[PDB]
Amino acid sequence: VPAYTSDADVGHYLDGAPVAGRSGRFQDVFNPALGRAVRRVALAGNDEVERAVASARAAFPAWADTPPIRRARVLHRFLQLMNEHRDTLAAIITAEHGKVFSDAQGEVARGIDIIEFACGVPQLLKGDFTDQVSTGIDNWTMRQPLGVVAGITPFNFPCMVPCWMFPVALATGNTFVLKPSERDPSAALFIADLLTQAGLPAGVFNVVQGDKGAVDALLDHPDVQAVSFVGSTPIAAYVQQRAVQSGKRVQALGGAKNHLVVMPDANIDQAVDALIGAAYGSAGERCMAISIAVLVGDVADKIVPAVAERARKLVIGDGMSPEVEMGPIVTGEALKRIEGYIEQGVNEGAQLVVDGRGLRVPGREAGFFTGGTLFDHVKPDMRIYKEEIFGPVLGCVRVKDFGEAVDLINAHEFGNGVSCFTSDGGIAREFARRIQVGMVGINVPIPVPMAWHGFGGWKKSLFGDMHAYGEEGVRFYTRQKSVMQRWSSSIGKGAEF
Amino acid sequence: VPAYTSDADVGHYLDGAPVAGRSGRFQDVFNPALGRAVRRVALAGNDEVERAVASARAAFPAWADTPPIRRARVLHRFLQLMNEHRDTLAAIITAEHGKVFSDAQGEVARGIDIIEFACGVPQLLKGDFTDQVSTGIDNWTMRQPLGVVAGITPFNFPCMVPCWMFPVALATGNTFVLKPSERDPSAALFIADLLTQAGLPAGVFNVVQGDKGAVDALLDHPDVQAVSFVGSTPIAAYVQQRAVQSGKRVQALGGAKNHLVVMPDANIDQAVDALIGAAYGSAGERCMAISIAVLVGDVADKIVPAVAERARKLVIGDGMSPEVEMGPIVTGEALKRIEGYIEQGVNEGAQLVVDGRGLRVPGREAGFFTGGTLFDHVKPDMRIYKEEIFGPVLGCVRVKDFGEAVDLINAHEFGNGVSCFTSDGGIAREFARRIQVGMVGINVPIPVPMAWHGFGGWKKSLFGDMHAYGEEGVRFYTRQKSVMQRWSSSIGKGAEF
Amino acid sequence: VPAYTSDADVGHYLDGAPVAGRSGRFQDVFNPALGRAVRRVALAGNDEVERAVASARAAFPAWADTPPIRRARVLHRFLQLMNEHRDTLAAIITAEHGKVFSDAQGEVARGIDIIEFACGVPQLLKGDFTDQVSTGIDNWTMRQPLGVVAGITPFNFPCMVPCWMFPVALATGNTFVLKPSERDPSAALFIADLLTQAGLPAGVFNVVQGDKGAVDALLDHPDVQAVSFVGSTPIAAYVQQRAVQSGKRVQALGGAKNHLVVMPDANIDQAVDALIGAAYGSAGERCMAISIAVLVGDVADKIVPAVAERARKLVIGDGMSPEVEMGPIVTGEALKRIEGYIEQGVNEGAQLVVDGRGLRVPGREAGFFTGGTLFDHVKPDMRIYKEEIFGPVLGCVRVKDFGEAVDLINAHEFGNGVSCFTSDGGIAREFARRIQVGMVGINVPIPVPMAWHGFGGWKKSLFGDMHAYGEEGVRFYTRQKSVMQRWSSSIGKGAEF
Amino acid sequence: VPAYTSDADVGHYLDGAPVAGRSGRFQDVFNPALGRAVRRVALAGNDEVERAVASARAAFPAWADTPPIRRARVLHRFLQLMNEHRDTLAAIITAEHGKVFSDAQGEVARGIDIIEFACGVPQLLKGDFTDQVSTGIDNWTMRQPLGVVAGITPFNFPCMVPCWMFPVALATGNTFVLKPSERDPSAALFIADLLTQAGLPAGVFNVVQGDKGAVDALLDHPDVQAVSFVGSTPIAAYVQQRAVQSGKRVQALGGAKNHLVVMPDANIDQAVDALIGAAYGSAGERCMAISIAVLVGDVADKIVPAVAERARKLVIGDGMSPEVEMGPIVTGEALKRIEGYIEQGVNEGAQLVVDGRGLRVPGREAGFFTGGTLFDHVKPDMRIYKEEIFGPVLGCVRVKDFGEAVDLINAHEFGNGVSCFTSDGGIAREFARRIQVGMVGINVPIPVPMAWHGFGGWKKSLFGDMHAYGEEGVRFYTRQKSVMQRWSSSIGKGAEF
Numbered sequence A, B, C, D: 001v002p003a004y005t006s007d008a009d010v011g012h013y014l015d016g017a018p019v020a021g022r023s024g025r026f027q028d029v030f031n032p033a034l035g036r037a038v039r040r041v042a043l044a045g046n047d048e049v050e051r052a053v054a055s056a057r058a059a060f061p062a063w064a065d066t067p068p069i070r071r072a073r074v075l076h077r078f079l080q081l082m083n084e085h086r087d088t089l090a091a092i093i094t095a096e097h098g099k100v101f102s103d104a105q106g107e108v109a110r111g112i113d114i115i116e117f118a119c120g121v122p123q124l125l126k127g128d129f130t131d132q133v134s135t136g137i138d139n140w141t142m143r144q145p146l147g148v149v150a151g152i153t154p155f156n157f158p159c160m161v162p163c164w165m166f167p168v169a170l171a172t173g174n175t176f177v178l179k180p181s182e183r184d185p186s187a188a189l190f191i192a193d194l195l196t197q198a199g200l201p202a203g204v205f206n207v208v209q210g211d212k213g214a215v216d217a218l219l220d221h222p223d224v225q226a227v228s229f230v231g232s233t234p235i236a237a238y239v240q241q242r243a244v245q246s247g248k249r250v251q252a253l254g255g256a257k258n259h260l261v262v263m264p265d266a267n268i269d270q271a272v273d274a275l276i277g278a279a280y281g282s283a284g285e286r287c288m289a290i291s292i293a294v295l296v297g298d299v300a301d302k303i304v305p306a307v308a309e310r311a312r313k314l315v316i317g318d319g320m321s322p323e324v325e326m327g328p329i330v331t332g333e334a335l336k337r338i339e340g341y342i343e344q345g346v347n348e349g350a351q352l353v354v355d356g357r358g359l360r361v362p363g364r365e366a367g368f369f370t371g372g373t374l375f376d377h378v379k380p381d382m383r384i385y386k387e388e389i390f391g392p393v394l395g396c397v398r399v400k401d402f403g404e405a406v407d408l409i410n411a412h413e414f415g416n417g418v419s420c421f422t423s424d425g426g427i428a429r430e431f432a433r434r435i436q437v438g439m440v441g442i443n444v445p446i447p448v449p450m451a452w453h454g455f456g457g458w459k460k461s462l463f464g465d466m467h468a469y470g471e472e473g474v475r476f477y478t479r480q481k482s483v484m485q486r487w488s489s490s491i492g493k494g495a496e497f
């Protein structure tokens, strides 16, 4: 599969067709491996957002009246098409985001998993029927679609996060307007085209490109019923407040600071492999990336020297090269912020075991590249421990026993993911049932739940009370109706009745 | 059972014991049938709210560690005690609220139904277990309690609405702080005493009396996790906004304007009986009360003359008299507001078929009594159609056919309850699946769902995305955790392993 | 699509490849439209059955260890292949069975529906997890595959009935041996080939052709765990007895005698259309075919004259002709038995309104053709009312009111399907909740439940206690295991633990 | 609580009242601690069985028409009564069965748990409702009662096993006829009296005493729909065959041979305590009793010497003495058979570490008493390993590693219960998912599942395909009905419609 190249402007999607921007405002889109802009993306105004919402509202009733099995068959055709063109989408993601090609393939596969789950929506839409609640009265419940829903997605997963939202929403009978991240929008348009090739009626799925202005226009529109958001914690709080102020259902996912605990009885080699992978995959630009390593007892001297040796030997380069393990950062501002965090960590007393600054890649000297960074003797009061770096920086914190590690983890402001490596059943049971984290792994560095369970963190990692996809996602996109029924005597109509 | 009389001050409940107020501010509590104050209720300050929250937080961990079956057994003993003392509670409710004694007995029975449902919580807390999601990895989910939750309840159901909230919350493993309506608080204290007699540990259930100040103190406290509110629409919106601003889970129920549709093929006598009962039970002080009668075709001339004849013959008096069908209004200000609504309805062109103003009850001349009021030829642009009166006022709106009635109902701002009387299966099916209302009745004037389904309206009748009690109530009070587990080889420990 | 022609012998399927018979015994296979044999089918001995069972048992462990999502993906590829080659399978079914081409297409579509449901097996295999049943003890359940299962299918649905069984059994992790009807076996082999093209491992699905001897060999084999059977009532009882005697799980479906009730307030034209279709589709060779019309009140004179007029105008001929509505009978012996039933009905006093005997089709004079037959004034004591004819014969029974019809239906020995045509809600509710029939239709002549509900009749129509496909089908193919877990203190291993 | 004494004849229960026997045949009932008969029990003939079945069939329709919530309230009152009189029932059980008083109290508590689960039947009877399966068609399922069901129970649990059956059957809407064990029938009558005091209508619950003749009369009766049986394997197979031959739903539970595995990393003291308790509680007369101890590696020398030391120090005497840990055997024939098994074990080469024969209890010299017996070096080919002794006999089998123990357990003919003691997570996971046993314990000697999961073994331990109580028990007592509904246009009735 050849590398993705294109210079045309990136527009919006409306009525089952691409449309060029009309506001006159554009933003450059960079190739991170080259360090220069390659195309532009239009920034939609209020009128284009209103046009997309009107199209979705016009399309909603007929799509809602469609039986769920036919909607599932449309999603089945879309799944076939997605399996057909996975390499092209992965190449687009590598070109714009900058991750490794195999990582993009894995992201596409993870989105296809959610689509596979959504294909079975007739089973998921079962209501409850109760007969003879009193003498001659029956009572049953069902769930019905809301209307027009909106989704706002980040840059690090331009394909998987939209697949967390739109398949289930379309399966339950809603219409969707998507606002992708402006740093890598092309994938969204690609997906929309595939949705049109699968037989989806026009207006059911629309795309608008833009920034904070388009988000505010979406949040203020009275014809929008629900909002799903994925991003950082402050923006999630702002989105939740503004959407609740206008009377909408909101779910918003925030940031993370994920810990991995190594017990004295853990497998050392597997723990080192897990730490390396989960800390330096995709250059640490994942919500489930491990950023703090908690070392218990005397295993620290068996972990830090090994991990450092693996950190210096990472292969860094262009994402389309097969042997490359880590790609560049998305933008230069993010790279500068990561370097500032490293400088702050050095200034506040943490030991800099491995320094990744000042990296030059041959043939990619202008790319936004950096090396892996490893700290030691990190303290809870340091800024590199409390704040989210979102880069290839790993810190090590040493504790005396299991209870100290549990208390340290429970005191953090984030509750997204946690992992523990051990061979003892009782320790695993107590850690699983005592930790204040939404997603827990036992010898699993990145515990992303399956498509039929749902994704969601605790504390400041989630604003709302429902999770993404799964049965939680099904319930978020529908509203419950109850019906109580009885009849009187029919002898009036005739003796036969 | 004798009438309830008492002159002691009404205080708060803390640590399994009543406590007198310490702020120094009190509010009078009236007997509506007599028209004069009979006791006082203390208004808690910020310090007393903080004390209650601290007690609940101290009690939370041990109660959460208790197995669900033992919590269910505590609730079972509480159910036995509630069945033992139902008449005393009903007499208290009649004395303070002013409803008929049989109506109070029905309210207590409806609360006991929710307690009966909550007794079966071990079945409801089943998680999902999946084996071999990949080779050697298992994945399971569970739901865990939130912590300290708060409930805010209105005056019209001083017993049933608190039973919508605290039984399920206690069954799932939370601690509860209740803020009852200050117009009739005594019942809450009674319930708390019963909860202590059933073996509930101290601090798990606390009561604070007060007003907007106590509500703000509860909404601002950082140790409170969830808020449940029942009341009018503006206060519900205010509560939701203020609680979301501090990062809490919120559910808030608002007002209503319930319609009943009479089709040309309906049973006339049963329709008249249903209209009379559902419009003039409890003096129209119910969220599920019918306030608009929609008459289709030529049945209007068969409905209005009959209903009016029943409206003039209502027996009105003190709630403890067995023959009385309707009691007084809760306060004199509410009576004045209802009379103002009647005057407005006369001024705007509606025909006043039956006028209930200027009623004097022999022996209860100082009571807040009023008669039944019936309007005719009500239009959608009138204020008596758009706004909630919350009194014994019924208006009649005439339409030409089924579609006009459906369009009229779907254009209202409220979506709480709706009813339709017919003998045709297709009309019932289309009405049930097309109406934009949360709770639907077919020949059922007041379609309150069963304890295992849940209570909730649509549009401006509910702020949030979860319903009260049932599985929705169970999910509102818990948070989901996912666990993924795997193990490595054990050959290192020995050849036997 | 051309008509299907082939003269090769029909063999068995083993280890992912066709195999020729080795017993030396064959049976002729007829083309019903031509009236002559066109090919042969081998009849397997005991050794070939044992070979198939051994292959399935050898393949079972690896297939059971496969994660459910990969099995679902194999079924997804099989679904794609089935959608690709539906017309060829329909042509084969028309050539051997003799039904109309559109009817065969509908049968293939109905099987594809069950495959679509089975593709979502990871959701269906969720167990129950409960935490802290007592202090420190957890309890969870799961369902695991049985092993080798066997299926026995009739002639009238050579594709749909096997799809009732093998997709769910393969999804839950079992291996399958199929014994198709010897009258039309080719479709089974076709399906097996498709299953091999989708990536199914060898030995997971095997086919053996034969007769009572092969069935007895399957029922006596100690390595077979479960048996599913579809056929007539006496054979179902025999199969259940013989399989239970050897300690196996059994489900067996029997015969039917389906009634349709016409109320005085029903739509006459729609009732006539439903009666014609459900009585003369596929020449009455369906378990859900309507064979008795129950007429209530004075509607009989509006039903019998119309239906008869439609019965004389049926177009009968070769199944590949587009304008043909009814095809021939499967064999000449069945045609002779149907004619004997008609003669018996004439002899016992029923009025022969329309006689279908003595039919000659131009160009198909040797085919097993017969016309539609209509009786009137049928009594419960007649043999044409009590016994199943399984042909294009419809009888009419007149009753006075609703209760008489209900009592008549509840006294029959069969309980498979029932239908009622009315416009009254109360009558529909009472009929649905009072009738002693497994499958009920309100204005639906053939109420076959959806893929996510399950298929099953009552009384003599089913031997066992579980239904086919759906959650019932999932539970039939799995066994439940419970696990209770606890751990002791880990302080012995170290102070850190 | 005083010891239970009574000399009146034990009769049957009919129409909510005790009735004396009329056949003229009686059987003596022994006090095992005294060794002499104390009363008689009548053995019902065919006519009395027919009378009980007729009474149940007469009572069935009204009980089935009762709403489930009222049936649940009847069960709630019964639960209150059972909690009130638990000590009297325990004393009766101790007097007739001969177990320790605390053991009888535990049995009563375990039955009360099942009653508590059954009190929540309205939630469990939820059907599935699906809207718009096609355009204008809805489909929903429900479950309805079967009719008259019969239960047959053993001697070792005269209270708990009947509570496995009749509460769920009554909750789902059936009528029950009970055939208790003739060795200790009084408890059944006691329970029936309590059921009458709770408001149960007459004829819903009937009791018949007897033996094989009464069982055959029950199995042959055409008005009985379902049979539940608990007992030994040969009788279970006979009952299943005879009940299937007459077309009934059957579930039958058989015998057991439960193994406990001790790993080298297990806690030695806790393992010894578990072995002693689970092997010598209730004199080994439990289906979940541990009869084989599997010792892996070098732990055998740390287990056998300790266990033997505990086996010689057991306190044996009358069950009403507080300090007694083990009571006598139920009959003298059972004691003789146990002694014969011990003699056979000595003859076939097993080492008799501890011999319990020749025991004399001071003051109870005529009682059917025996001591604890411990064998060592037991082989799979011995009769004491393959056959069920059902007494206080424990054998020890030594294996080399984990795989040998798993292979040994999987080769047995019984699959009821299994336990494994270890501190390693991976070993526990592999043992739980690989063992061919229905009920599994990790560090739990007796893994009886909770009331909301269900009880059932595998292989020769269960005949049928459904388990006892839980959702399996709910599904066994009900049959599923499907309803598909649609309506035509209503414009014919009028323009308004």
Ligand SMILES: NC(=O)c1ccc[n+]([C@@H]2O[C@H](COP(=O)([O-])OP(=O)(O)OC[C@H]3O[C@@H](n4cnc5c(N)ncnc54)[C@H](O)[C@@H]3O)[C@@H](O)[C@H]2O)c1
Residues within 6 Å of the ligand: B152, B153, B154, B155, B156, B157, B179, B180, B181, B182, B210, B211, B212, B215, B216, B230, B231, B232, B233, B235, B236, B253, B254, B255, B256, B286, B287, B388, B390, B416, B457, B461
């Ligand atoms: N949707 C439902 O299920 C439901 C049920 C019952 C009643 N209601 C509604 O309740 C209303 C009648 O009850 P009410 O008159 O007691 O309602 P309300 O709005 O006064 O709510 C009562 C509660 O809110 C508190 N409250 C009142 N004003 C407040 C303020 N400004 N700030 C903060 N807290 C404040 C009170 O102290 C009390 O605890 C009607 O509108 C009726 O429709 C709704």
